[PDB]
Amino acid sequence: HWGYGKHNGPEHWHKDFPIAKGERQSPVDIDTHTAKYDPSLKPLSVSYDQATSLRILNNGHAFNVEFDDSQDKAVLKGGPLDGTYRLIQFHFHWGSLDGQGSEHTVDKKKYAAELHLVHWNTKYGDFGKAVQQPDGLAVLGIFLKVGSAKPGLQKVVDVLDSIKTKGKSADFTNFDPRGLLPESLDYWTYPGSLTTPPLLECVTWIVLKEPISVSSEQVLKFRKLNFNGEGEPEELMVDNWRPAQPLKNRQIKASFK
Ligand SMILES: O=C(O)Cc1cccc([N+](=O)[O-])c1
Ligand code: NI
Ligand code: NI
């Protein structure tokens, strides 16, 4: 019964999941000066026109916006990827304060939040099988800074009062995740892991260089969510980020000079 506290947070997870101390754990600090520009990288293709959002769920650690992943409706290809990766969900990690919240850091800078668009490799047939493979997932990561509002985020923010507590869900159809992307698709990439238990080393990370801007008011609404279930003491869902882990024997590659 893991979480983000003193007693059950990141620094404890290794007792249940020894892979927490593995060779390709995420997130990491992105040292921009040492990431190498890679010309082998094929261009990134985000094809979200046919996306079908279905539901938003408070899973006790975050909220997930879930998609129909039963066809190639919203897919990621190119970049560092071989093959086609299907969108299953997106989520965020965020802080108690604007000065922290992201999982990846950029030259040690922490952003207020980080958006993760999670995709699985269609060669493995479903998500559950894909997470068992070293190239099973592709996560597109987007930093959030506090400034102007992000108009395409407001639909997500407004429904959060309906899923305040763990295990609550609500219908969430017709949401277009294209409205959460920055202008540029320049990126860094490296091999890593999921960042909660079970910490599986199945992710090709693709972290965009350009953050999106969200308003103070939008991020404040994330911080009104609860880790707890209804009828349990209130514990605000904040600081649901794992800190940076050792890079070990990995290289971060840049798609841009
Ligand atoms: O890496 C995370 O944010 C934790 C996590 C946990 C379980 C599933 C996830 N997913 O990518 O579907 C992500
Ligand atoms: Ni547990
Ligand atoms: Ni994540």
Q: Would you call the peptide bond into 10 cis, given omega within 30 degrees of 0 as the criterion? A: no
For tokens 């080393």, the residue is: 201
195 is annotated as contributing to ligand binding: yes
Taking the CA of residue 116 as reference, the ligand 1 atom at the shortest distance is 3
Helix (H, G, I), strand (E, B) or coil at 144: strand
Mutate-to-test residue for ligand 1 from 116, 137, 240, 242, highest number of ligand atoms within 8 A of CB: 116
Q: How far apart are CA 3 and CA 60, in angstroms?
A: 9
Positive or negative, the CA dihedral 23, 24, 29, 31 is positive
Q: What is the DSSP letter of 231?
A: T
Active site residue 61: yes
Burial of 188 (0-12, 13-18, 19+ CB in 10 A): buried
Give the distance, in angstroms, between the CA of residue 25 and the centroid of all CA atoms in the same chain.
14
Report in angstroms the alpha-carbon separations of 165 from 25, 150, 228, 234: 29, 24, 6, 9
Q: What is the DSSP code string of 5-63?
A: STTTSGGGGGGT-GGGGSSS-S--EE-TTTSEE-TTPPPEEEE-TT--EEEEEE-SSSE
Q: Where are the domains of the chain?
A: 1-257
Q: What is the per-residue burial (b if ≥16 Cβ within 10 Å, else e) of 44-74?
A: bebebeebbbbbbbbebbbbbbbbbbeeebb
Positive or negative, the CA dihedral 206, 186, 117, 48 is negative
Closest by CA position to 101, among listed 121, 81, 116: 116
Kindly state the greatest CA–CA separation across the chain: 54
Q: What is the per-residue burial (b if ≥16 Cβ within 10 Å, else e) of 113-146?
A: bbbbbbbbbbebeebeebbeeebbbbbbbbbbbb
End-to-end, the C-alpha distance of the chain in Å comes to 44
Q: Whose CA is nearest to atom 12 of ligand 1?
A: 118
Method for structure elucidation: X-ray
Residue 107 token pair: 């030259």
The type of residue at 114 is E
- Contact assessment for residue 11 and residue 190, using Cβ atoms and an 8 Å cutoff: no
Helix (H, G, I), strand (E, B) or coil at 78: strand
Phi, psi values for residue 36, rounded to 5°: -105, 135
Burial of 30 (0-12, 13-18, 19+ CB in 10 A): buried
Give the distance, in angstroms, between the CA of residue 174 and the centroid of all CA atoms in the same chain.
21
CATH topology of domain 1-257: Carbonic Anhydrase II (3.10.200)
DSSP strand pairing (105-106 vs 29-30): parallel
